[model samples]
Target: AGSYKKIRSNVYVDVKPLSGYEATTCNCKKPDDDTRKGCVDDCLNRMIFAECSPNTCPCGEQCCNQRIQRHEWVQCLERFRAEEKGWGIRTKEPLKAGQFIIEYLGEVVSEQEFRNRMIEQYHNHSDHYCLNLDSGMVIDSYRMGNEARFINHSCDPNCEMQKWSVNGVYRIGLYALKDMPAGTELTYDYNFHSFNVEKQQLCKCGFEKCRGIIG
Candidate 1:
């Protein structure tokens, strides 16, 4: 009866903001390159693993679309000690030490694709990214839409994305980068040192004393 439409014995609903981004731009005021409806859809069916509705299971989640009980919860939120902080639905209210912020967004790819991208980058540039074999191309297409995108780099990271799977889905959990304050920017050891010592990775994240490298 609303923006929702129905199919053969199934219903389709829409999510808000069109794009599942915490903010349109980063604290640096740079806009995300590929924020779109398709990304949003993938983020729903795949990342954040948003179910049909509250307390619902997979396809078997809440079947009553357009019903009073039907609603897609906010899968993620924009948190920045630099910008707006302490404002994620998943957090419920305020998170404690070691609390979960949101899952990192990425998808596994063929080893060939991984090698291809990394190789191409390496060949084109004199430097190369220390490609992780375990997580070679498990790349985040939405790296463009994740907190890690704006999470600014630090020589000493205070957070890390703990990876795991649930109900047959892979996810990355964001943990405290440090003793984060109520309005502190979340970060992690991108572990850049693990790769390039020169830290060819350029960062301008607005931290007190920014480290040109990830870790």
Candidate 2:
């Protein structure tokens, strides 16, 4: 079971997709000399929210680690009562700050495959020009499309990406750039940060000194 199936009493479980507006976004801009774009899935690169039913995961102390994809299940990590962190998460051991947790998991879809899905989603989605990249690059990771997808903003962020040994593992090896606590929501700075020159990407991560462009 991952993330306590839900944040116990703090969060709720509904057997439906999250209620929100569909995005109206396009790819970011890159330099003329640089031709990187359409390499990664736009939706997956940013944070998103996924939802399931109470029965989707076991309720009340039971964690259901069932991802949308067909797969095996494991006993969920137990969430202890905490005062610091608002919600609780299951950790295998007493991990100190900066401990390398699991890596993000999911299927590896290439630029073409991601484009197919994007086309399937936004009918007019254009890849040739709409895609943004660094001389032909994409930023994508295999996540079963979770709210973790919604984890946004990392300019000089402490959280960085860690490649997994194999596929189909639901983990992102996040480390504390600074000291953190048990209940703290672990975050990391994306080291290879960049931005779009054309599109004015706006975010409200609430970081006191947020970057004008994603640092």
Candidate 3:
């Protein structure tokens, strides 16, 4: 028995447009030993929040921008149960600020299907793990997801979620907001927005600047 079934990447559920969108390639030349490495800030794709594909990127194998594609997730991470927050993840070793932790892997569904699930399946569930992307697509991790789903919410978060385009597909990734010591529980502000205030849950992160409620 494990906490839940693990998936390495998102599972598309009738969600189209997985690829064939105009591939945004960068002109970053190969780097010398001392010169600048992979696609840096100057990369056009990166500037537009798009990730380059290994086959199309000019840097070829030297490209460091393809973290998601390369699966360069950080190691030494472990999961444990918190008294109030249910399950949570923690780093076994010290982590630096701005470090890439893991990708938010889940099942990608259309907006209409998401609503159907809300009304039909998850209406009575206390905990929901659905994330909406910029393109109106929703990622539901409740039934199928990776360890990133265990990350709890905090008013003052040590980690932040950022959305990036991978070969035209939207993907969410977790990054450290500040340096933290080993055994520190990973948390992020849910930044939930809802018109119904009554459905909001009380925040129990126990942080100094607790926002009182988690939407």
Q: Residues 1-215, candidate 3: write the lDDT tens digits.
A: 13456788888896853533544678888787644577875887777767788888888777778887777898878889877877788999999897778988778888778788778877887776767664557778878888888888899899988778787777888889999998999988887411121357888999888989887
Poorly placed runs, candidate 2 (over 4 Å): 1-95, 122-150, 164-172, 190-200, 213-215
Q: Give the distance in Å from residue 118's predicted Cα in candidate 3 to where it truly belongs.
A: 2.3
The candidate maximizing lDDT is: 3
Give the better candidate number (2 or 3) by lDDT: 3
Distance from true location, Cα of 45 in model 2, Å: 29
Per-model TM-score, in order, reads: 0.42, 0.38, 0.86
Model 3 CA lDDT for position 75: 87
Per-model CA lDDT versus the true structure: 0.36, 0.31, 0.77
lDDT score for residue 114 of model 3: 78
Q: What digit string (tens of lDDT, one per residue) describes model 1 on residues 1-215?
A: 00111111111112111223221111111123433212222224334332223233222322222111232222344543343322221222433464455544333344555445555543454322221213333432321223333454455555665543332233345556445544444555556312222335554444677665443
Candidates 2 and 3 compared: the better one by TM-score is 3
Itemize residue pairs with steric clashes in candidate 3: none
RMSD of 2: 18.7
Model 3 global lDDT (CA atoms, 0 to 1): 0.77
**Quick one: best TM-score, which candidate?**
3
lDDT of 2 by residue, 88-207 (tens): 333333445433443333233335544554447534421111212222232232223222322334454544444221112222333335544343443344324222223344433346
List ranges where model 3 is wrong by over 4 Å: 1-3, 17-23, 34-36, 192-198
